[PDB]
Amino acid sequence: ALRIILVGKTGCGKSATGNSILGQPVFESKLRAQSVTRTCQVKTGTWNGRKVLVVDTPSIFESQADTQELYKNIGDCYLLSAPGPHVLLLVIQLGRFTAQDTVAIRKVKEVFGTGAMRHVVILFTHKEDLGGQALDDYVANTDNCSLKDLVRECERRYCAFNNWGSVEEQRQQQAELLAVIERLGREREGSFHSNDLFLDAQLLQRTGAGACQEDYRQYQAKVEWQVEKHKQELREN
């Protein structure tokens, strides 16, 4: 089953994108009113006839203080996606890429570590705000050099959704996403991104472990120690 993680800042369209991939209203996407979801959600479904697992994330990828809540939510993120994501689905609201999305790119690296960008697919929400203009023409021509680095680091793997789109318009934009993920799956030969904390999470959930050596405090502690490794190795530039 194809494992996908929705990443990005709050309000860019992670939940709506996950709802349009699965074709169901399953992740909370409020319009204006107060939200309830504070933690990672996982929903299994079918997408283009292929079985899919989608992990939606809270505000893990934003300016924030180091607290138990952060590591609980990064911890749930690896638990749900174990043994690791095939695709990291980085959601950018088209037209609105600001300092916070730049911060979100930084913290995608800090959460997942070295090698995670080989598995990233940009997904531009608000395709409709692009006028009658082409997406390839937009990405080549934006005055946003933070965005253009991200496109070159993702090897030009990127797509656009109208999450409020019609049935036809939803069908079309799912096929164009499949094309990107097909091409990514062949370039990775079916590989999923992984590190020790993914591996540590995989062993923790698999039945037949029969020790319960590790604990929800100990796991969340391993989560913190892993992210600081990512922060060391990334301060080394």
Ligand SMILES: Nc1nc2c(ncn2[C@@H]2O[C@H](COP(=O)(O)OP(=O)(O)O)[C@@H](O)[C@H]2O)c(=O)[nH]1
């Ligand atoms: N018009 C339009 N609205 C969108 C799109 N994607 C998301 N939204 C809206 O943007 C708001 C925030 O989106 P949401 O999925 O909750 O973003 P999240 O904070 O990353 O989970 C929601 O009310 C959505 O209805 C899109 O492609 N087009």
Ligand SMILES: [Mg+2]
């Ligand atoms: Mg959401």
